Amino acid sequence: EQDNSDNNTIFVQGLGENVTIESVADYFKQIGIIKTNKKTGQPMINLYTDRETGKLKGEATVSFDDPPSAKAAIDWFDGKEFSGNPIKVSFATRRADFNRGGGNGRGG
């Protein structure tokens, strides 16, 4: 964020009732260092869990202490498996409107 395309922050999708911080920190600590927190002194990852049923969603973003390390990870994981399931590691894509439709896009 704030003028940065190599955002160490990555995006992991495809967990499955296993999207945890330590789980991601445990398996995503070989390629590089995970964004450790100053409160718990441990890696920091954003995960989406359910509150109505009390389960997980299966999607979470992992923060990295080294921007270049995030890319190197994507080069490897980008379609890896989480305890059996498949995942998709990215370079923290942008979330917003205006995509493939508007001013540009032509091509005929």
UniProtKB/Swiss-Prot annotation:
Post-translational modification: Phosphorylated in its N-terminal serine residues upon induced DNA damage. ATM and DNA-PK are able to phosphorylate FUS N-terminal region.
Localization (cell): Nucleus
Phosphoserine carried by residues: S63
Chain ranges of the RRM domain: 8-94
Phosphothreonine PTM sites in chain numbering: T9
Cross-link Glycyl lysine isopeptide (Lys-Gly) (interchain with G-Cter in SUMO2) placement: K57
Tissue: Ubiquitous.
Asymmetric dimethylarginine sites (modified residues): R100, R106
Highest taxon, organism lineage: Eukaryota
Recorded family membership: Belongs to the RRM TET family.
Disease: A chromosomal aberration involving FUS is found in a patient with malignant myxoid liposarcoma. Translocation t(12;16)(q13;p11) with DDIT3. A chromosomal aberration involving FUS is a cause of acute myeloid leukemia (AML). Translocation t(16;21)(p11;q22) with ERG.
Function: DNA/RNA-binding protein that plays a role in various cellular processes such as transcription regulation, RNA splicing, RNA transport, DNA repair and damage response. Binds to ssRNA containing the consensus sequence 5'-AGGUAA-3'. Binds to nascent pre-mRNAs and acts as a molecular mediator between RNA polymerase II and U1 small nuclear ribonucleoprotein thereby coupling transcription and splicing. Also binds its own pre-mRNA and autoregulates its expression; this autoregulation mechanism is mediated by non-sense-mediated decay.
Record text on subunit structure and interactions: Self-oligomerizes (via N-terminal region). Oligomerization is essential for chromatin binding. Component of nuclear riboprotein complexes. Interacts with ILF3, TDRD3 and SF1. Interacts through its C-terminus with SFRS13A. Interacts with OTUB1 and SARNP. Interacts with LRSAM1. Interacts with SAFB1 in a DNA-dependent manner; this interaction tethers FUS to chromatin. Interacts with MATR3. Interacts with SNRNP70 and POLR2A; these interactions couple RNA transcription and splicing.
This protein's name: RNA-binding protein FUS
Gene name tied to this protein: FUS
